[PDB]
Ligand binder design. Structure first.
Ligand SMILES: CO[C@@H](C(=O)NC1Cc2ccccc2C1)[C@H](O)[C@@H](O)[C@H](O)/C=C/C(C)(C)C
Ligand code: NI
Ligand code: NI
Length: 284
């Protein structure tokens, strides 16, 4: 047997960032200045995004190594926060439209945007950790779902198939392909198992802004005309549900849970379209 439905816990104090680490412009403001930027980045931006991606990937790996029964989602946050700040990076989630921590921790039925808190991880849980780094004036965004102890076969299979769906989507990325192939591949694959692909939350262009206005759908919609072009940078971050798509948002305004409380899994990379294919920027 697995855990029953989650409830929100209490937050730890806001974690400090040394002043020499530049903040993204949106910290503490009600909105963010993003959504109207070009989608193909300059070479100088791309090189800085390889640095930001690798530091985010390090933070996600360190916190992922800590996922185990008995560890709280707040403890994960502490590890991601400390890794980012000790690398001179600002945690892009911290202060984004009031979000109060340095990564998102989404267990079980939480589709996305769970807030690290006093929740204790237990055996059987699946734990998504999503960390973004801001450094060099650019962002790098990556996430993965980690099993805690021995996870039930249907939950294990959902995690592993969601990882596969993400890899197959990444492997489609090539200049000249329609962006819509990403969702086509993910949804076709997911539907083989009777899973449902979340529609209202998507991937996104990323560069000097966190969500740059480019939207990357994870379901099939070939009416989107956008093509992949060298220099384009975006995330692929499918959330795939065992149950129905209907969801609710907790009173914190952030935590998104499945209404039927069936579990859901996600993985994410920041990608660069190169002249021949793809380069994963959030790579160790
Ligand atoms: C799933 O989550 C992604 C997400 O909300 N996409 C948006 C959902 C959406 C809906 C319509 C149009 C664009 C987009 C991009 C998001 O980009 C995460 O990967 C990121 O790490 C977290 C950001 C905070 C918690 C600070 C918000
Ligand atoms: Ni993310
Ligand atoms: Ni993202």
């Amino acid at each position: 047997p697995s855990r029953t439905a989650l409830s929100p816990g209490v937050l730890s104090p806001t974690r400090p960032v040394p002043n020499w680490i530049a903040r993204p412009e949106y910290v503490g403001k009600p909105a963010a200045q993003e959504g109207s930027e070009p989608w193909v980045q300059t070479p100088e931006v791309i090189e800085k995004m390889r640095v930001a991606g690798r530091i985010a990937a390090g933070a996600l790996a360190e916190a992922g190594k800590a996922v185990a029964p008995g560890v709280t989602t707040d403890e994960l946050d502490r590890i991601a926060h400390e890794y980012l700040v000790d690398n001179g990076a600002y945690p892009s989630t911290l202060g984004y439209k009031g979000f109060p921590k340095s990564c998102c921790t989404s267990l079980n039925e939480v589709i996305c945007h769970g807030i690290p808190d006093s929740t204790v991880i237990t055996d059987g849980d699946i734990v998504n950790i999503d960390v973004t780094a801001y450094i060099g004036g650019v962002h790098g965004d990556t996430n993965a779902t980690f099993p805690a102890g021995d996870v039930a076969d249907e939950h294990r299979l959902l995690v592993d198939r969601t990882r596969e769906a993400t890899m197959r989507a990444i492997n489609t990325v090539k200049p000249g392909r329609a962006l819509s192939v990403i969702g086509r591949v993910i949804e076709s694959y997911a539907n083989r198992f009777g899973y449902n692909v979340v529609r209202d939350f998507t991937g996104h262009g990323i560069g000097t802004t966190f969500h740059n206005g480019l939207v990357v759908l994870h379901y099939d919609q070939p009416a989107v005309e956008t093509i992949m072009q060298p220099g384009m940078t975006f995330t692929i971050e499918p959330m795939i549900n065992l149950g129905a798509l209907d969801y609710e948002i907790w009173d914190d305004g952030w935590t998104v849970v499945t209404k039927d409380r069936k579990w859901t899994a996600q993985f994410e990379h920041t990608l660069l379209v190169t002249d021949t294919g793809v380069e994963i920027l959030t790579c160790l």
